[PDB]
Amino acid sequence: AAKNVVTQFISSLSASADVLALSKIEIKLSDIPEGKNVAFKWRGKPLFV
Amino acid sequence: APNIRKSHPLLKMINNSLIDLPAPSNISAWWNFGSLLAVCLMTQILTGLLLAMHYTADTSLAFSSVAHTCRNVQYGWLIRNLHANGASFFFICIFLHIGRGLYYGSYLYKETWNTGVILLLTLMATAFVGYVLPWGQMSFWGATVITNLFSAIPYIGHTLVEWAWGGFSVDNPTLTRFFALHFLLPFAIAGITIIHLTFLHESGSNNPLGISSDSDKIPFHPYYSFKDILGLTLMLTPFLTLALFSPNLLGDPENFTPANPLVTPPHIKPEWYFLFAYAILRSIPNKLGGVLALAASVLILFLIPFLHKSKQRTMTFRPLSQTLFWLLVANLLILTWIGSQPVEHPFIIIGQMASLSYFTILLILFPTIGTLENKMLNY
Amino acid sequence: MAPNIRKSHPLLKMINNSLIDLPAPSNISAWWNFGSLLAVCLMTQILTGLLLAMHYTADTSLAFSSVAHTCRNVQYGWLIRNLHANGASFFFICIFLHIGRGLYYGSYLYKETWNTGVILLLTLMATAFVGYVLPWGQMSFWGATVITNLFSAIPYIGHTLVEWAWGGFSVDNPTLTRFFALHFLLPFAIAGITIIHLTFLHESGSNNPLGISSDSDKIPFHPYYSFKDILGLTLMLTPFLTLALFSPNLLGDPENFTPANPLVTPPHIKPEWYFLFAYAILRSIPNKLGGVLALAASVLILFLIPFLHKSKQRTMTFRPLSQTLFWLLVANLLILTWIGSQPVEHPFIIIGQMASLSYFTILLILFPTIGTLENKMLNY
Amino acid sequence: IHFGNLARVRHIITYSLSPFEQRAIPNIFSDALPNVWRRFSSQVFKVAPPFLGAYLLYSWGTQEFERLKRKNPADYEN
Amino acid sequence: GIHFGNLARVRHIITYSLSPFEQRAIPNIFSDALPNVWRRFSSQVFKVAPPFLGAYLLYSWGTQEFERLKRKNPADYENDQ
Amino acid sequence: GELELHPPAFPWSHGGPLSALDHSSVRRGFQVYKQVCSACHSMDYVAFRNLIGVTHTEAEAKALAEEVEVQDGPDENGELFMRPGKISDYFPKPYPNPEAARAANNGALPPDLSYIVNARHGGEDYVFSLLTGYCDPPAGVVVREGLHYNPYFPGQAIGMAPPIYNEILEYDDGTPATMSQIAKDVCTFLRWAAEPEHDQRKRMGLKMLLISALLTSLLYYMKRHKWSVLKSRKMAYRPPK
Amino acid sequence: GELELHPPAFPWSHGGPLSALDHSSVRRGFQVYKQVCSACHSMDYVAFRNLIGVTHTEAEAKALAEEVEVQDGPDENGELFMRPGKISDYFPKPYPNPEAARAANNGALPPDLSYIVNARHGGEDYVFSLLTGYCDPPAGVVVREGLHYNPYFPGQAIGMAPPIYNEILEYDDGTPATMSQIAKDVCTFLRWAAEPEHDQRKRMGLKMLLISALLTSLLYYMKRHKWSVLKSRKMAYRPPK
Amino acid sequence: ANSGDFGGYYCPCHGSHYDASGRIRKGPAPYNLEVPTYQFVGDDLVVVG
Ligand code: HEC
Ligand code: HEC
Ligand code: HEM
Ligand code: HEM
Ligand code: HEM
Ligand code: HEM
Ligand SMILES: C[C@@]1(c2ccc(Oc3ccccc3)cc2)OC(=O)N(Nc2ccccc2)C1=O
Ligand SMILES: C[C@@]1(c2ccc(Oc3ccccc3)cc2)OC(=O)N(Nc2ccccc2)C1=O
Ligand SMILES: CCCCCCCCO[C@@H]1O[C@H](CO)[C@@H](O)[C@H](O)[C@H]1O
Ligand SMILES: CCCCCCCCO[C@@H]1O[C@H](CO)[C@@H](O)[C@H](O)[C@H]1O
Ligand SMILES: CCCCCCCCO[C@@H]1O[C@H](CO)[C@@H](O)[C@H](O)[C@H]1O
Ligand SMILES: CCCCCCCCO[C@@H]1O[C@H](CO)[C@@H](O)[C@H](O)[C@H]1O
């Protein structure tokens, strides 16, 4: 009983369903000249393309 | 000192309150609610923190942050059920603890008793501000009714209410401050519990026969540690059964609807543990009068120790008082029931009856019968 | 039982035995004033904190502005915020001097009082950290990023713990709401552990500047130290209020007046002054895990002090060589503090590693060594 | 710390057995249940009564409330 | 908790004190106080001051050195064209 | 005045303490919400991903989401644009705000249905009785224009016209789309929408009961075991005499 | 590469520890913000009511607010509508989002100015030096198209063209609108915008200093008084025979 | 964006240098900038996630 209750409570602090819901983002390669670096926020962190 | 359990400045304290503590050999199940109340407190705090870590105190986000908790947080729904129902379990246990106290005249330990009442008052405030947080229709209006009670105070009344609100009505500043209070109060309860048990150890426990147990004491461990752990699991079954098989038996469906400042629910009814008091508040058709009756209905507890006329401590050997005692309990059931009904015949009259008898049993019959019983014993 | 309530009552009895009839050394100096000042910061912080908490809103979209709302709309909200922000600093100034006094006078020989003392420091640190993150400005965010990512240096479980603590893949809203709750809670653990601190302490009562038994000359806490303490309170209260009322932003980073931006990191991320010396140490080791350990050790080294005492005398009052070594250490800390506020570049980098290296050298080698050396010069 | 200074006791002997030499729940039928009945019996007419009364007041008041919701045909006779 | 009365075994020591009302709160400021403040200061300056003086120097240097390295070195463009 | 008719208790296959929800029924119920109720009712708290592994497969869920156009942005010009739905999106709101909603329902506001079975006394029993219980007003009772008589709705005059009737849609699983069949399914769906944890909660309750039975017994013994010492203890008073 | 020019310290009339803000200057400063800076800079945290009793009369403040059209609603149809401003409204944002802002400023984002003097090292000293310090780049330095050389801005190439020049506006109080005069005022205004409590804070600081001087002295005496007992205490060791 | 003695990236916090490929060349940084898993709309779009 202790192992379960403590496990449940512990996990209540790890990524919730909405957060784990992860998608993909499309980026057109015609908006970035040759040499440029564009940053796109994504899954919390910055996405470098 | 030869053994650490006694010399160490910290263990010394654990030993003197949970290991070598002298306890009466004959205390019954009615002496189990003290520890159960302690566990509710630890349980409530622990589940409350876990909920607070996903809660958001803002009228535009309160309701949904709770929804977010129950729907997205791993075991969020479970933790919420345990918290919401734990509050009920807390009141069930506090009421039985109180009953035991009145029956066995535990109130003759005045300081333990008085702090006991402070604890009750504090638990009430806690439950109240906590109940308002989810911000449903019931949370909102209950918060409206309750806070407006204080407006009944003459002169300073309107001023205090608007102050407490942080504006002209229950609104966001009320919610944010209520969250803070709800977070803080439980810890005052924990602290005052220490004072409660500190006064108590000055004399140790009372017992069912109401006669000195110095001739027959036993170490708290393992007698009551084991008995207490047993009592824990016994009460833990209904709690979990309720929370896991009937999560919403005790709640008003109205609180599943976002608070609406413009529409008041048709039948505003408080949580079960406040019904009997609500009933009393309504018995007096006068605003201020009804508030005083409500205040007195709880503060009457500070008066109990002074209405003790019996030459005996408990009611164990007092058959007339025992009847008077169960009448009072039943009287409370009636009030509870009356508090859940609308203000209409026959309820209105039944209510005023029960209200009137409640105070009559405590202020007149109990001391009177106690004196009468003394004479029948030839004292 | 007893003729006077001050002694018989079960609650007053406690106040009497710790703040009225408590036997205190007749000669303790101003350095013994920081205990009570620390207690007053604690009560002051809690009070101002609740008051701020009543208008705060833990949500990334509302954090920054709720604080702004507090300073701009709440009657005296601005004042209460200044008192809270600056109170955190006075809290560290006082804890640092409290520790300094402890090391100098060998107060650490009261091992339990000392150890709980270190737990108190650690807890205060956590508290200040989660608290600093709440306003959610640029510095709140990135500092929260740097600090939390320190834990990712732990091998194997590192990444796992960090993402757990975050409640997601980076510092975000669930980090903020859980940080608020922690910030609300911890101060009370501090208060509780303070009781344990003073409880262990009373087992022996205070030490004193000469480091010799004061049983021959003790005096009631009241009115000697109650009056002395209230005086010390108002003396430190002036700078505090002067700073808060005439220079509210002397200690903060202007960067925190800019809403956190996940995509732009400030050019010069610099921690609050009370964390600079440690930060300096963290950077001395150009290796992620190595730097983290140096940082951990820089504080946990305090648990080791009681075992590095070789002197036959308790304090440093009659030990001139240790006194030098002592001020070297203090100055070493200044250097680290200064180094922690500069960019990682020559000559700072080398100066930094020097200071870091000597910090540990003074504590682990010179102090016990010199202590032994001094014993011999006394012919012991 | 109270054991040792509780009471002044004389000439009382007590006998006990290790918990391993005895039965945890002995004489259930010859002693336990008979006593549960004894206890129940000695209290039922003290407790039950007021609760019975509360129950009645409840039944009545409830039925009366619903009865007053019904239509009185004598209001539309003419 | 309660300690006065069981602290130490003391013998043959007499002490004399006056009520706070029979005496001056801050007496002999010039004949005693300040002279002693000076004594105290003096007996510690060469213990404390030194390391701080050194910290100050290291600070001055390191700061100046940092800024110096920001300056331009004319010998990097002498033969530039 | 305050005359009210309370719904009967239907034997839902998820009413028992260990009775899960009928997922086939929940899947169907979803279609009813999607094809009928969503035209006027929002369900703010449920997203297309919630369907996965419950009533639909991931592939299906994605499809369902892409059928919807959702607003996003701002883009580079600071403009809002439309895009196809993602499983992480919540069910589309029929209106931008209650004002618009009322405006499209004669001043009446169709409530969000995420927690409707818990926000009404009677739960699905009440939602089912209301959906299948429309009828003409009794003698002496006149319903104002725009409202419809329903004995189950408080006041009896509801602003919602009977939403479902036979074959108003076709279950792609071949179930005979009768009015009551439809109500029964959507109601089941509503139960799930309100407490997605329903099933897991009951599986836990089962374990809770078993562990509790066991543990309570063992602890009872242990308490009795230790206390046997005092329970069977005997004593006597032997004064010198 | 690591070169930067730091602004000098101007003798602002509000720099002294007991120096209030010059309200005439703050009033003027506001006009500069309203008529010049607000075209690209937002000031999200200040409302027209904040002006009252500080720089403007209630009647004036109301006028100022009504000059703006603000969005409100939804109305009866769930539609958003426009209305004239109220003193309770905050200053109008020039753009709907930073994307639009950048879009209208060559990819550059003009920051909100509510806390700008506190969000930049140097405060008004820096804002003043930047506004009046534009000049041509030094030999060997080329500014990319769209940027302007400013030695005070880090990197020295700013995306903001010199916003103010002589007589770019007329102070209705007749003050000679010279560039530096305008900068000095708007900067004073910015100080106020960032810390509206500026003045009150300093008045409190005054009292704090007095009460503190007094209280510290009295408590110093009391401590000395009580301790005089031990301070002048004498003792001797008189062992027997 | 485009800073560091390797024409790639430079971290202002403690001075970690990365090349135009995102690899760690100089500084405290233990590994190279993560390469997210990136389905393929031929040419003109990139589905990352
Ligand atoms: C044309 C729009 C429309 C459709 C389609 C519709 N509803 Fe409604 N619904 C309403 C309106 C309008 C109300 C408001 C009734 C009132 O308060 O007067 C309402 C109210 C309700 C209520 C109960 C309100 C209460 O106070 O108890 C429920 C439950 C409900 N609808 C369920 C459904 C379900 C399930 C469906 C699909 C089978 C459905 N509705 C389809 C318009 C609609
Ligand atoms: C045509 C739009 C426009 C006008 C008008 C304007 N600004 Fe700006 N301002 C900007 C832009 C764009 C930036 C961005 C500069 C950058 O980051 O490259 C900026 C930046 C600033 C900054 C400093 C940014 C920094 O990082 O240090 C301040 C301060 C500022 N402006 C003040 C003012 C004041 C005061 C006025 C009115 C006297 C004003 N601006 C009017 C466009 C303008
Ligand atoms: C937060 C609420 C409370 C907690 C945690 C608590 C806890 C305890 C504990 C652990 C005990 C010892 C064991 C027992 O006899 O039950 C106790 C005893 C007692 N408490 Fe409380 N209590 C609470 C509330 C109250 C209240 C509301 C009253 C009275 C209005 C009260 C009156 C007493 C008294 C008089 C006793 C003496 C028991 C005896 O007769 O031996 N308590 N309580
Ligand atoms: C004496 C112990 C406590 C009692 C009696 C209590 C009671 C309650 C009540 C009545 C509710 C409403 C439940 C509902 O939603 O229906 C509530 C809500 C809440 N409580 Fe407590 N609580 C206690 C302690 C705590 C503590 C210590 C915290 C936090 C550190 C806390 C945090 C919360 C939060 C965040 C909610 C809102 C979420 C929710 O409504 O489920 N509570 N509490
Ligand atoms: C929340 C933090 C703290 C509070 C509130 C606090 C409070 C106190 C109090 C009131 C005293 C008695 C008066 C005095 O001598 O100053 C004391 C003494 C002491 N504290 Fe703390 N303390 C804190 C932190 C610490 C720390 C960080 C250490 C050590 C790492 C520490 C070590 C001690 C020791 C050893 C003494 C003995 C003093 C003597 O030599 O007589 N304390 N503390
Ligand atoms: C040990 C005592 C405490 C310390 C060291 C402390 C420290 C801090 C720090 C460093 C900040 C950030 C200040 C800033 O805005 O720059 C902060 C913020 C905050 N603290 Fe505390 N705090 C303490 C106790 C509390 C308590 C008890 C509460 C609440 C019951 C609290 C509530 C807050 C709130 C709401 C903020 C956000 C508003 C703001 O940033 O000004 N604090 N605290
Ligand atoms: C949980 C509850 C509650 C808890 C304790 C109470 O006791 C009091 C607390 C403070 C002041 C007076 C009574 C009262 C209500 O809080 C709350 O909003 N309600 N709901 C409610 C509904 C209608 C009228 C009055 C209240 C409670 O029952
Ligand atoms: C106030 C401050 C802080 C306080 C106590 C600390 O001590 C620790 C607390 C927990 C864990 C490790 C250290 C560290 C930082 O919180 C915070 O975000 N910062 N800012 C910061 C900036 C750059 C790097 C690291 C931190 C602090 O200084
Ligand atoms: C005394 C009461 C003890 C309660 C023990 C019951 C343990 C709950 O068991 C739970 O069952 C869920 C459903 O399968 C799982 O998803 C959880 O991970 C598991 O911990
Ligand atoms: C890396 C380890 C991954 C383990 C995935 C944990 C998935 C938890 O799965 C759980 O199973 C229970 C029993 O079927 C269900 O009742 C819960 O709703 C479900 O979330
Ligand atoms: C910085 C802009 C200041 C404008 C107000 C001038 C009055 C300053 O003065 C102070 O203002 C406070 C708040 O208004 C009052 O509470 C104080 O009593 C008052 O003395
Ligand atoms: C040692 C602590 C001394 C605190 C005394 C400071 C009292 C300042 O008092 C404040 O002065 C302001 C200036 O007009 C007023 O606006 C405030 O209302 C008033 O409370």
The three-state (H, E, C) secondary structure of chain D, written as one string: CCCCCCCCCCCEEEECCCCCCCCCCCCHHHHHHHHHHHHHHHHHHHHHHHHHHHHHHHHHHHHHHHHCCCCCHHHCCC
Burial class (CB in 10 A: 0-12, 13-18, 19+), B305: middle
Q: Which residue of C has its CA nearest to H14?
A: C344
What gap in Å lies between CA B347 and CA B188, rounded to an integer?
Answer: 38
| Alpha carbon distance D35, D45 (integer Å) | 17
Query: Which of B:29-68 have CB within 8 Å of C?
Result: 49, 52-58, 61
Residues G90 and G151 in one domain: yes
**What's the topology of domain E1-81?**
1.20.5
**Residue F149 and residue F139: Cα distance in Å, rounded?**
12
Longest CA pairwise span in chain H (Å)? 39
CB contact under 8 A, C169 and A15: yes
Strands (DSSP E) contained in chain G are 69-72, 81-84, 148-149, 157-158, 234-237
Query: Rounded CA gap, B178 and D5, in Å?
Result: 49
The closest ligand to the CA of F206 turns out to be: 9
Query: Would you say G161 and G148 are in contact if contact means Cβ atoms under 8 Å apart?
Result: yes
F117 touches F107 (CB < 8 A): no
- Counting Cα atoms < 13 Å in the Cβ hemisphere of C204 gives 16
Distance of alpha carbon F52 from alpha carbon F66, whole angstroms: 15
Q: Are residues F152 and F112 in the same domain?
A: yes
Residues F137 and F29 in one domain: yes
**CA D28 to ligand 6 center in whole angstroms:** 62
H34 touches chain C (CB under 8 A): no
Tokens of B153: 């105070």
Residues of C annotated as catalytic are 202, 206, 228-229, 272
User: Please, which chains are in contact with D (at least 3 CB pairs closer than 8 A)?
Assistant: B, F
Extents of the domains making up chain C: 1-380
Resolution of the coordinates, Å: 2.8
Alpha carbon of F199 to those of B77, B244, C143, F22, F192: distances in Å? 12, 11, 43, 10, 9
Which residue pairs, CB below 8 angstroms and at least 24 apart, start in E15-18? E15/G233, E15/G234, E15/G235, E16/G233, E16/G234, E16/G235, E17/G229, E17/G230, E17/G232, E17/G233, E17/G234, E18/G228, E18/G229, E18/G232
| F72: enclosing H helix or E strand | strand F69-72
Domains in chain G: how many in total?
2
Cβ-defined contact of F234 to D15 (cutoff 8 Å): yes
Statement to judge: residues G77 and G14 lie in one domain: yes
Residues G53 and G84 occupy one common structural domain = yes
Phi, psi of B61 (to 5 degrees): -125, -10
Shortest Cα distance from G213 to chain F (angstroms)?
Answer: 57
The answer to whether the CB atoms of C163 and A15 lie below 8 A apart is yes
Mutate to test the pocket of ligand 3, among B25, B196, B232 (most ligand atoms within 8 A of CB): B196
Nearest to H15 by CA among B154, C283, C215, B236: C283
- Judge contact between B248 and F115, C-beta under 8 A: no
Say yes or no: domain B1-379 is CATH 1.20.810.10: yes
H2, H12, H14, H38: the catalytic one is: H14
D13 phi and psi angles, rounded to 5 deg = -115, 145
G155 at the E interface (CB within 8 A)? no
Q: How far apart are the first and last CA of chain D?
A: 87
Give the CATH H-level superfamily of domain C1-380. Answer: Cytochrome Bc1 Complex; Chain C (1.20.810.10)
Cα distances (Å, whole numbers) of residue F4 to B269, B331, B337, F155, F214: 18, 30, 21, 8, 46
Q: Do residues F191 and F231 both lie within one domain?
A: no
Radius of gyration for the alpha carbons in chain E, expressed in angstroms and rounded: 30
Output the 3-class SS for B99-158.
HHHHHCCHHHCHHHHHHHHHHHHHHHHHHHHHHHCCCEHHHHHHHHHHHHHHHHCCCCHH
Same structural domain for residues G47 and G161? yes
User: In terms of Cα–Cα distance, which of C166, C160, C119, C111 is closest to C141?
Assistant: C166
Q: State which fold the D1-78 domain adopts.
A: 1.20.5
Q: List, by residue number, the catalytic residues of B.
A: 201, 205, 227-228, 271
Distance of residue F75 Cα from the nearest chain G Cα, in angstroms: 7
| E8–C216 CB contact, under 8 Å | yes
Q: Which of G2, G228, G236 sits opposite E25 (nearest CB)?
A: G228
Q: Residue D21 has which token pair?
A: 């030499």
Chain C contact for H36 (CB, 8 A cutoff): no
Query: Mapping DSSP to helix (H, G, I), strand (E, B) and coil, where does residue H18 land?
Result: strand
Q: With an 8 Å Cβ cutoff, are E69 and C218 in contact?
A: no
Taking a C-beta distance cutoff of 8 angstroms, is the pair C244, C90 a contact?
A: no
What is the crossing angle of helices C276-284 and C320-340, to 10°? 80
Q: Is the CB of F200 under 6 A from ligand 10?
A: yes
- Is A1 within 8 Å of F47 when comparing Cβ atoms? no
Residue F186: closest CA among F4, F5, F55, F70: F55
How far is it, in rounded angstroms, from Cα G101 to Cα G113? Answer: 14
Rounded Cα gap, residues F116 and F114, in angstroms: 6
CA distance B53 to C49: 18
Q: Is the Cβ–Cβ distance between B128 and B277 less than 8 Å? A: no
* CA proximity to A42, closest of A28, A20, A22: A22
> Distances in Å between the alpha carbon of B228 and those of B29, B90, C179, F11?
9, 16, 36, 41
With touching defined as 3+ CB pairs under 8 A, do chains F and H touch?
no
| A21: contact with F, CB 8 A cutoff | yes
DSSP letters of B256-323? GSB--TT---SS----GGGHHHHHHHHHSSSHHHHHHHHHHHHHGGGTGGGG---SSSSSTT-HHHHH
F213 lies in the same domain as F145: no
Q: What is the SS3 assignment for E75? A: helix
Task: Take atom 18 of ligand 8 and give the residue whose Cα is closest.
Answer: C143
Cα-based angle G209, G210, G216 (whole degrees, multiple of 5):
85
Closest CA to B92 of B33, B32, B30: B33
**F200 CA to centre of ligand 10 in angstroms:** 10
Same-domain pairing of F91 and F162: yes
CB of C122 shorter than 6 A to ligand 5 = no
Residue type, D39: R
Nearest CA to ligand 3 atom 29: B116
The answer to whether the beta carbons of residues B213 and B26 sit under 8 Å apart is: yes
The CATH number for F214's domain is: 1.20.5.100
Element (H, E) at H26: strand H24-26
CA–CA min distance A21, chain F (Å): 6
Q: Is B201 among the annotated ligand-binding positions?
A: yes
C137 within ligand 8 shell (Cβ under 6 A): no
Domain range summary for chain E, segments of one domain joined by +? 1-81
Q: State the SS3 of chain C.
A: CCCCHHHHCCCHHHHHHHHCCCEEECCCCHHHCHHHHHHHHHHHHHHHHHHHHCCCCCCCCCHHHHHHHHHHHCCCHHHHHHHHHHHHHHHHHHHHHHHHHHHHCCHHHCHHHHHHHHHHHHHHHHHHHHHHHCCCEHHHHHHHHHHHCCHHHCCCCHHHHHHHHHCCCCCCHHHHHHHHHHHHHHHHHHHHHHHHHHHHHHCCCCCCCCCCCCHHHEEEHHHHHHHHHHHHHHHHHHHHHHHHHHCCCCCCCHHHHCECCCCCCCCCCCCCHHHHHHHHHHHHCCCHHHHHHHHHHHHHHHHCHHHHCCCCCCCCCCCHHHHHHHHHHHHHHHHHHHHHCCCCCCCHHHHHHHHHHHHHHHHHHHHHHHHHHHHHHCCC
CB atoms within 10 A of CB B64: 15
What residue owns the CA closest to ligand 12's atom 15? G204
Cα F144 to the center of its chain, rounded Å: 31
Specify whether F233 is located in the same domain as F190. no
Contacts of D77 (CB under 8 A, 6+ apart): none
G210 and G183 together in one domain? no
Q: In 10 A of CB B73, how many CB atoms?
A: 27
Single-letter amino acid, residue B336: T
Q: Is the CB of C113 under 6 A from ligand 5?
A: yes
What approach was used to elucidate this structure?
A: X-ray
User: Which H/E stretch holds residue H7?
Assistant: strand H7-11
Place of tokens 């309107």: B158
Query: What six digits make up the tokens of C358?
Result: 């000597």
Q: Determine which of F46, F49, F203 to mutate to test the interface with A (most A C-beta atoms within 10 Å).
A: F49
Decide whether any atom of ligand 2 lies within 6 Å of the G183 Cβ.
Answer: no
Inspect the interface and report whether the beta carbons of E15 and G235 lie closer than 8 Å: yes
Q: Which of B94, B118, B129, B274 to mutate to test the pocket of ligand 7 (most atoms within 8 A of CB)?
A: B274
In short, whether C135's Cβ falls inside 6 Å of ligand 6 is: yes
Alpha carbon distances (Å) from C264 to A39, G64, G81, H11: 10, 36, 36, 11
Distance CA E44, CA E56 (A): 18
Calculate the alpha carbon distances from H30 to C350, G15, G185, H3, H23 in Å.
Answer: 21, 48, 51, 19, 10
Tokens of C150: 């320190």
Q: Which residues pair with C193 in a beta bridge?
A: none
**Range of the structural domain that residue F204 is part of:** 197-241
Which residue matches tokens 């299948």? F132
Residue B363 CA to residue B303 CA, distance in Å, equals 9
Q: Which residues of E touch G237 (CB under 8 A)?
A: 12-13
F9, amino acid identity: A
C270 touches chain B (CB under 8 A): no
Q: Position G192: which residue type?
A: W
Q: Do E14 and G235 touch (CB under 8 A)?
A: yes
B5 touches chain A (CB under 8 A): no
DSSP state of B361: I
Residues of A in contact with C165 (CB under 8 A): 13
F147 and F70 assigned to the same domain: yes
Residues with CB under 6 A from ligand 3: B 31, 33-35, 37-38, 41, 94, 97-98, 101, 104, 106-107, 109, 112-113, 116-117, 119-120, 123, 189, 193, 196-197, 200, 205-206, 301
Q: G35-40, long-range: CB within 8 Å, 24+ apart, which pairs? A: G35/G169, G36/G163, G36/G164, G36/G168, G36/G169, G36/G186, G37/G113, G37/G163, G37/G186, G38/G91, G38/G92, G38/G94, G39/G94, G40/G94, G40/G101, G40/G104, G40/G105, G40/G110, G40/G160
- CA dihedral angle for residue C92, residue C93, residue C96, residue C97, rounded to 10 degrees: -150
**Three-state secondary structure string covering G26-89:** HHHHHHHHHHCHHHCCCCCCCEHHHHECCCECHHHHHHHHHCCEEEECCCCCCCCEEEECCCCC
Measured between alpha carbons, how far is B361 from B359 in angstroms, rounded to an integer? 6
Task: In whole angstroms, give the CA distance from residue C166 to residue C151.
Answer: 11
* Identity of the amino acid at G212: S
